[PDB]
Amino acid sequence: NPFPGPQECMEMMFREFGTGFEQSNAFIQLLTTLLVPPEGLNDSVPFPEWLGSSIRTLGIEPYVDFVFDVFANRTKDISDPSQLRILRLSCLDFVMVCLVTFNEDLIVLGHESNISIDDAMAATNLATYVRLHPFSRVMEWLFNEKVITSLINTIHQDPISLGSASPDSPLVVSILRAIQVMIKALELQETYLHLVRPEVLRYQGEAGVRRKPVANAAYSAFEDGILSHLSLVVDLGKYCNLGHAELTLACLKLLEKISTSSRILSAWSPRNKAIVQLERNGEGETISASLSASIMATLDPALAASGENYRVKLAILDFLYACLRATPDQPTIAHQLLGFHCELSKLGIEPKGPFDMQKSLFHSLLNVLITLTVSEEEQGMRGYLVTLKYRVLRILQLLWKSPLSASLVMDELRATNFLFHMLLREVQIQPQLPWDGQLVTGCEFLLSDASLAYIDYLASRAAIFEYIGKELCSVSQNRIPSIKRQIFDALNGQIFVPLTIPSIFDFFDFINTDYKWEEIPSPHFTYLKDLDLGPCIGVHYDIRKAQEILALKRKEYEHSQLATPEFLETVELEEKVLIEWLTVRNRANLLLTARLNLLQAWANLLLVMIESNDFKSTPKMAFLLQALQAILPTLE
């Protein structure tokens, strides 16, 4: 009643506060600040449940509705680009503050066990939370064409502006916020369409609510509204040459999620559109060149896990892995970025191209891999180097297994002596060399993160052995002794360019039963002994399945009213021991399967070597006896 009905006065005041930019931005900031709870950034949604109960209003929805209507329609009356950028940034921040304040796991567990197991008392609380929280309205607005059009217009800008702009420029911050909102929407679209739409529809059907739809029924998902924009990927790729770590990581994650989808790649390749869009003015070439220049940039030894360069490298590697693992038979953008001529159900190399001159992304990866040393002195056997090489080897294996990109890759590898570089980069493992300053025999080893690096190193050795065996089989079937001599010399322990290297029998040091990975010390467990891991269990024992059971048991014991305060610490320490027991069992299973895979790879390599061997046997009798001596204790 601002001094005329309230439904009219409120909209009149909102429209009055919409004229201009200063007052609009100030109101948006005020609303964003008010939406923050007093405890800071989970229940008790930050607003009174009786907000607007007197008048026939939907609560706090009108505010978000007006904000979205403004951001969608009145963005053309702003001449000053700075004001428009500030308004878009404020709207994106408001949307993010509204989305981040939504419970996902809570609603999932509710819809799962509340009505099916728990009573119907708390159901009303979750219902009111889902009905009053503005997340549903934001998601509904996200399916509008105006919103995505404004977003892609804001993200589509000239490169000169971003180049001459400052890292703290509002344009970069707005683009980052928009990418984050898009990521959150792509993550929560399924949860919404599953546990919001039906409940809201049922509530609207039962009770009396007057709401105006703002979503498009045709857009069954968020990808339907964005699959019509081809310049988005081009802009995301061009924005990688700016140097901004956060923006680069966001763009890489967005491209990875896009390549991971299915409808987008079904619409693109039902000839194709992306390959021709990225080959308009040589965008792929410059993108590959920028990626190569980036991965070649060194890292900061002190800021191992904080070096933005290493983070960008890992993001690019994850993107390539996700793009190659998805739909390997049909080519993708990864093949074009590597320097291949992506043709319909066929690949090829062009003359004088970047991949022909051995200057491309794949060759850059090969170089940075062969010029990488993991053997250190101060710590020795670092972890992030191991992770990097493991990712590189996974990408190489994904490229090799694909028969569409196997022959050319093997040719390019054998034409540069990659196996020789790998062997020269090999390092022997012993129980004395610690992992990141920590010894293996220590009990904390199974609890520390060194297990991941150990599994990665085992997988790397297995992949190297498999590649060596495949190359040996190829050279044998090709009936050419020009390379067989060098292969045997490398296996004999000599190199003629003589440089010596440890033989294959030297690397047979990963089979050791002294650690007793199978045996586990079982504590007394005077209580909770009957709690098994039935619902916990692909050997993967979930911890929540036992956490809920032990919590229910503790609640029952407390309700029994028999020395509940004293014996609580016993149950607490038993749970703290059981969680580490489960983690140790999982790590032991992982180590066991890794050792099994490595042993299988080594056995296959040895079989391929023994079978395809025309060299005399009397000289190799020494190696035969050595292998027999080495396997004797293993069999025993």
């Binding site: 051995q358 540069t416 570089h421 360019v497």
Partner: peptide, 9 residues
């Protein structure tokens, strides 16, 4: 063609 890929330590 192989400026640095050579095995010349």
């Amino acid at each position: 063609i192989l400026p640095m890929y050579k095995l010349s330590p």
